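Consider the following assembly input.
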Amino acid sequence: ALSNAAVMDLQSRWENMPSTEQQDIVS
Amino acid sequence: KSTYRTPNFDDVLKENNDADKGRSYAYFMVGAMGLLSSAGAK
Amino acid sequence: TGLHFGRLSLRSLTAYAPNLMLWGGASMLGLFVFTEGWPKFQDTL
Amino acid sequence: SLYKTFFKRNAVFVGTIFAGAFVFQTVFDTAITSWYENHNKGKLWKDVKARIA
Amino acid sequence: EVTQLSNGIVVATEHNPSAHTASVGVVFGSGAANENPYNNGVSNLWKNIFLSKENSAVAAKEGLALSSNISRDFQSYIVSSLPGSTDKSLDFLNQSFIQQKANLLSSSNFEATKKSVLKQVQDFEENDHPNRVLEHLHSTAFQNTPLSLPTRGTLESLENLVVADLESFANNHFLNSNAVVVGTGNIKHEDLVNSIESKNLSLQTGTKPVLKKKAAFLGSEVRLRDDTLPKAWISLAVEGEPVNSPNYFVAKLAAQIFGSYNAFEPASRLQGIKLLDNIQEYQLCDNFNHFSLSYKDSGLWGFSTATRNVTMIDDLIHFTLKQWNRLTISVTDTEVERAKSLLKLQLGQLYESGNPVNDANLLGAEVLIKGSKLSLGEAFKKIDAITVKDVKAWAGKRLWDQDIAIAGTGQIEGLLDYMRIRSDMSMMRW
């Protein structure tokens, strides 16, 4: 799976989120 | 929920909080009430 | 190393003096407002 | 700034309150008086006495 | 002398031949402000992993002492030793913290460290009032911005972490472009650079994440009232100066003017602080102190206080804020003259203490922002150059009719509403 902290509530968390940080999640 | 997390106040808050613009608008409204009040008391 | 005092300092009287004149000026402005309509004070109004 | 000149000192903040209230006494009095006479033109005493000519 | 070389990683060193100890450390430019509300407390967990029993045991077998510090803007990992063994600290730092992290992130070790950190944070949140009040002041001043996240981490978020969060944070933030290698005590700069060059000591590639929102200050308050406690603890602050501001030293001096007070020490009742003239008669407080804290984006200037006089809180706040009002209009020259020497002694002990760990932390945190370290001598001349006009100019800008942040706990029923306090930031007689 993937770490519980990252995935949960990844909607209100999509914005105000570092670009390099959010490019790791899609990989 | 943790106390450190704070409740949503977004619909109440102004977009740009500038102290000089913000305190000037409030003071002008208070000043207007004082200016008409001084006239009425006289 | 001691300033003239009477429980009020000399240094603190010169620091308030520019503001004291401004408060005096603010008081005369309040006098003309409240004593308008006085015919005798209308000589300089 | 505009704040630094007017609203910073309470000595000059209330001074311009009294200064602006000094002007408003006479400007507002004349503004209301003129419209009142204009809305009632042809009825006031100065119009009837003027008609006697 | 402070010597800094950009070859390899940024290497800073301050040599003191008198000392009988040497510290070597790594300071990272990431802190509790680089994490989010869902992984908040990952930095504290990393610290407690570096400070775990097995790592500390392997370190202490060689004769080394480990220190770790977590803050808003940096993370410090320091190895202290005797002067002859300064090369061994680099070897331990390479072998353990940098090269391999699989052993430190095993299942059992992670679970034990997580349970210990949870216990520590739980004890802190209930039985440490003056510091958690300051934490809530930070959390309410910079809300919805990175700087407001508590450094230890919340109880609710610390449970959700797994090893994946830790390794992700290590991948994102433990980088060569974010690190400074610091040397303090009885070591030479040339020897330290040569020792690093002999090994590789490469950390990672670079390009740490850039934050999308910069820290901002909001006038607000939080009240955590509890009537089973004997006192009331209150912290109050306004926006201050950040690091690298021209008004940094003026801020520290204006803070030093009011100083700190303990009611039970006989000497501190005779200080030249005029505020005490109003406090002493009715025993309004047990203790207070004044602070000027500076961060990379913003700062906090204010005071913190504790009292048992639960019926006279408003008088204490009123008199304190009227003493603050005096700064703008009628500060006197003798006050500034006393403040200069008090600050110089205050700064003197901070930067010239025997313990090299404080020097290492300060040098690493300084070179990560300024790019160089200000000398003790040049600090004094700026302190001596401060005049009354400068203090008035700073105070008329930073605290005259400005928004405040308040945080209190205990029997705070006597603490009045926000606006009544906010109106005390001006005199209305001037």
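Chains B and A do not touch (no CB pair under 8 Å). Ask yourself how this observation constrains the way the partners meet.
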